[PDB]
Amino acid sequence: AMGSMERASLIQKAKLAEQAERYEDMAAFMKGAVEKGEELSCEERNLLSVAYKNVVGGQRAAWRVLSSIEQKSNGPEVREYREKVETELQGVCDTVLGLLDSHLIKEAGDAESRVFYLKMKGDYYRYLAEVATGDDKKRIIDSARSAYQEAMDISKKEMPPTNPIRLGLALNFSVFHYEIANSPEEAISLAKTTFDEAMADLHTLSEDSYKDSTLIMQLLRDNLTLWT
């Protein structure tokens, strides 16, 4: 419904909405900006990702609360309301996936944009997989895996091992392995190898880049501590 608003005004309002913690508005403004058809800059990609991560993060937290209640109970109300939340979460994931497919990924030629969008694709299929059951769950899991793997292959060829996007991709793919794919050993191996290769490249970084990379490395180590 943002077709009448200037691209630059959508971007400015997405930044205001972030400041106001109005993440649904922020996501709608950034959807409108994507639908203008131009490629997104680095800052604009981050606004798109932060907006949807907050929207779907709230939905995932609510779905987990409701699923836990539903499982304790096993009237229709808890299941019905968990289903409503689940459908709304699926719709947000489908919206993000649709933006990536029309046409952000196909126009992304630089490694930093292409890896960023393919990591997002893996993440939103992963959130779909968290609520999926059975022999839909399998194809959704494979779609997440395939997106993360393409991003990994580009990131290893094109970015240094300390690049924050490369690090966050590896962190999230390791969580995919541990939590979705039932591959805890692959999760641990990926987190360890990523951490060690980043450590060995820290000497090349400025003070500010060092802070950026070590922050994400700490998350890899925190997961390794929890998993071992």
């Binding site: 981050n46 990702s49 932060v50 969580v175 997961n223 929890l226």
Partner: peptide, 9 residues
């Protein structure tokens, strides 16, 4: 465990 929090900036 933790994915990228990714909810700020």
């Amino acid at each position: 465990a933790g994915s990228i929090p990714g909810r700020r900036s």
